[PDB]
Amino acid sequence: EEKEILWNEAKAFIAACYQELGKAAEVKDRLADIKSEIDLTGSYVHTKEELEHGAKMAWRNSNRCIGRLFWNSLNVIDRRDVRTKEEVRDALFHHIETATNNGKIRPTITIFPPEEKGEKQVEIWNHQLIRYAGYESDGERIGDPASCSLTAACEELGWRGERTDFDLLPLIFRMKGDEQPVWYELPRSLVIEVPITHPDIEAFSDLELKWYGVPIISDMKLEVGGIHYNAAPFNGWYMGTEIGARNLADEKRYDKLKKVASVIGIAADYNTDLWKDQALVELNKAVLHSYKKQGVSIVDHHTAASQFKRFEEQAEEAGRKLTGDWTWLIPPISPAATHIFHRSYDNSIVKPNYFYQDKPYE
Amino acid sequence: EEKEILWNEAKAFIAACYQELGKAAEVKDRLADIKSEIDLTGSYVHTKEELEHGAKMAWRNSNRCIGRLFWNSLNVIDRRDVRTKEEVRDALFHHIETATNNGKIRPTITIFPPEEKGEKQVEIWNHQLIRYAGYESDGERIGDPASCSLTAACEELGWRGERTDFDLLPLIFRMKGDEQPVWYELPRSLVIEVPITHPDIEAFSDLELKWYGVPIISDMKLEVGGIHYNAAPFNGWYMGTEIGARNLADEKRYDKLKKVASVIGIAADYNTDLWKDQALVELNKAVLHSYKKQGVSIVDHHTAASQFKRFEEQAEEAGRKLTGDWTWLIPPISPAATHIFHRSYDNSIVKPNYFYQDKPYE
Ligand code: HEM
Ligand code: HEM
Ligand SMILES: CN(C)Cc1ccc(OCc2ccc3ccc(N)nc3c2)cc1
Ligand SMILES: CN(C)Cc1ccc(OCc2ccc3ccc(N)nc3c2)cc1
Ligand SMILES: C[C@H](O)[C@H](O)[C@H]1CNc2nc(N)[nH]c(=O)c2N1
Ligand SMILES: C[C@H](O)[C@H](O)[C@H]1CNc2nc(N)[nH]c(=O)c2N1
Ligand SMILES: [Cl-]
Ligand SMILES: [Cl-]
């Protein structure tokens, strides 16, 4: 039933993929080849074309993603050839450099060897390739609370952060055969960071806020035709609200709203003053401003929702069913000002797709 | 099966109601009485206590309502005795006066005779007892687009609005036996309206915005123990976002954001300026300010979400399952600043409850 589930997923994927690629006549022989390859080996190997299209389909099927208009221009890097921790490290370094592209961010995914029989070849521990550490000692919070457990796991392994609010975590991953992961400090020249300033409130820089340029999600599994690529980091560019309404604003993250309110000169005393809302708007304005000023790609939530409307229209024109998760697609500020808020979406799960998987630590 | 569905709903309601009222021992004889009453008459009549508690339970079970902490203090007015259109009119007038309470709004419901065998005794046409008319002729929009079809139905019946942006619709309802509804102009002395001003932007009054004080929803059906009270208008006080983020801001309603942006002195040209968000905040601030200044009850969304957290805690302490509709409970501005956004709710439907029903017009 191992070979059964795989074979069925393979048939459905190959058929759909080859149809979209205008290759429907080659389906028969390809499925024949695959059938034999599974019988003899227990698995099968995607061609470069199948893998690239599979990764693109997986993005197109990501219900929670508002950024999907651009699914077809995903830059897919095939690293199924890596065998060593130095190769993995260098592939991760290269991904960062090529995705960053001097600030003109390229949506990119790097695909490592897939699981064999549930056995991981490479297991990445980072949630994102670039992220800030988090600490707590003596009721003092430092850095990003969302990184607290990974940060403690790294320091167990001999890493030590400087305990600033913005320490970059090391890359950390484990190779098949090894009992422990290894870690590598990120070279600073690879990492673009953006200091947060406001277009017309000069005091805003007193907050000394910054964020990194590129979100490179590295803990999701790509599934394509029954093959499980558990290590396949990918990135887009940020939507400003991710930084301004969540990373910097959530009480369980950097919790900056009261400080923002103070620098923009409003009281943080009464709910009816809507000071949190006002602070959120000014922080989100500062975030868009700062990325644009530095020449780092970013999208605001209005522009993103307009793009998503086009994605919806493109889906209809192509005869493809659209799936989405309304609770994730709506932006966390002014959601009712977007068309998303005013319609519903089918939250069905279609494969290929990206999936959560269990953390190797904690 | 008519009497069957009713009998079953009655047993479930009476049991639950009497348990909460500490009257569990009287359940047996009450169900006996009810059994006979159904057999002989086809229906049964709620006592004053059952009706009042039923209406309160129905509010407590309203998944979409963030205002539910105060479910137990609902003021229930029993008007099952009305037989004439003048009595219905006067009950509706009285509801407005007593709910308004000079601006210190009392959550109130007035309950009219229930459907007999699906036959309505009274059929209210208004969506809310107080609402503004809407018109369109020659591509000119006037007033509230959401009222366009009711407004046209009223004018078909001899009503004529002055075609201001804020014409009050007449009360309109139909009595069993009558082919056509009747309408009655609302006496102005009954209706509190609030002009919208901003606490520190003087030009804001140039918009000449206003809204009415009390939302009195009049087109939902109350169901309690199998009895269908299709005419049972009820009100709370507004949450400010209903007015500022939806009624005055939605493009399909008053569509005021571009005008707000202009009076607060910002450009409405670039999505990255977040001018819609900023305009929304200033409009919502103006709305809270204006109601408070006039002495009309209103709640901001932060305070409302804090109350709802207490409702959740009260539900747990009472051993009652909580139900909610996340997509409706989140406020349309800064939803991620409320605890609601960060948890999930079971959207199961529990009776007693309030339900949508078919419009009698259009
Ligand atoms: C190109 C720019 C992109 C933008 C602006 C964008 C925007 C977003 C946003 C705002 C979220 C919600 C994140 C959160 O609230 O935690 C999201 C979720 C997601 N995006 Fe995209 N995205 C982009 C590119 C990509 C790419 C390249 C992929 C993969 C090929 C991808 C796959 C996903 C997935 C899988 C999720 C959901 C993750 C989860 O369940 O937690 N996106 N996207
Ligand atoms: C006391 C102040 C109250 C506040 C602040 C409040 C708040 C709200 C809000 C903001 C909504 C969403 C409305 C929308 O987006 O269209 C809502 C929905 C609702 N409320 Fe309340 N509410 C209150 C009192 C009441 C009362 C007294 C009842 C009935 C006894 C009630 C029953 C409901 C119902 C049934 C809905 C959902 C209607 C639908 O499905 O469209 N509420 N409430
Ligand atoms: C918080 N973790 C434990 C769960 C978790 C894992 C992946 C997640 O991905 C979010 C995500 C994924 C892809 C994105 C692509 C672009 C973008 N701007 N944000 C993006 C955000 C989110 C949460
Ligand atoms: C738009 N109609 C066609 C459907 C419709 C019917 C009743 C509706 O009730 C909304 C509602 C109900 C009760 C409320 C109580 C208090 C409050 N502040 N808003 C409240 C808002 C909403 C939509
Ligand atoms: C439980 C709750 O629904 C959940 O935390 C969601 C809500 N919607 C969201 N939407 C986005 N884009 N991102 C999130 O992290 C969340 N959190
Ligand atoms: C289709 C869409 O989900 C729907 O229009 C909802 C979204 N959530 C909402 N929430 C509230 N409180 N009120 C509304 O009118 C809506 N509209
Ligand atoms: Cl992030
Ligand atoms: Cl309203």
CSV table of C-alpha atoms and ligand atoms in Angstrom, one decimal, chain B residues 127 215 217 219-220 234-239 242 328 356 359, ligand 4:
chain,number,residue,atom,x,y,z
B,127,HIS,CA,-34.6,45.6,7.7
B,215,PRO,CA,-29.8,49.7,15.2
B,217,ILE,CA,-33.0,44.8,13.5
B,219,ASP,CA,-36.3,41.2,9.7
B,220,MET,CA,-35.0,38.2,11.6
B,234,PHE,CA,-34.5,43.7,18.7
B,235,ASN,CA,-31.6,46.1,19.3
B,236,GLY,CA,-28.4,46.6,21.0
B,237,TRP,CA,-26.1,49.6,20.7
B,238,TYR,CA,-23.7,50.1,17.9
B,239,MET,CA,-20.1,48.9,17.8
B,242,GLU,CA,-20.4,49.0,11.9
B,328,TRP,CA,-18.2,37.7,11.7
B,356,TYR,CA,-32.6,35.0,8.4
B,359,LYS,CA,-37.9,39.1,2.1
C,4,LIG,C1,-28.4,42.7,4.9
C,4,LIG,N1,-29.6,41.9,5.2
C,4,LIG,C2,-30.2,41.5,3.9
C,4,LIG,C3,-29.2,40.7,6.0
C,4,LIG,C4,-29.0,41.0,7.5
C,4,LIG,C5,-30.1,40.8,8.4
C,4,LIG,C6,-29.8,41.1,9.8
C,4,LIG,C7,-28.6,41.5,10.2
C,4,LIG,O1,-28.3,41.8,11.5
C,4,LIG,C8,-27.0,42.4,11.8
C,4,LIG,C9,-27.1,42.8,13.2
C,4,LIG,C10,-27.9,42.2,14.1
C,4,LIG,C11,-28.0,42.6,15.4
C,4,LIG,C12,-27.2,43.6,15.9
C,4,LIG,C13,-27.2,44.0,17.2
C,4,LIG,C14,-26.4,45.0,17.6
C,4,LIG,C15,-25.6,45.7,16.7
C,4,LIG,N2,-24.8,46.7,17.1
C,4,LIG,N3,-25.5,45.3,15.4
C,4,LIG,C16,-26.3,44.3,15.0
C,4,LIG,C17,-26.3,43.9,13.7
C,4,LIG,C18,-27.6,41.7,9.2
C,4,LIG,C19,-27.8,41.4,7.9
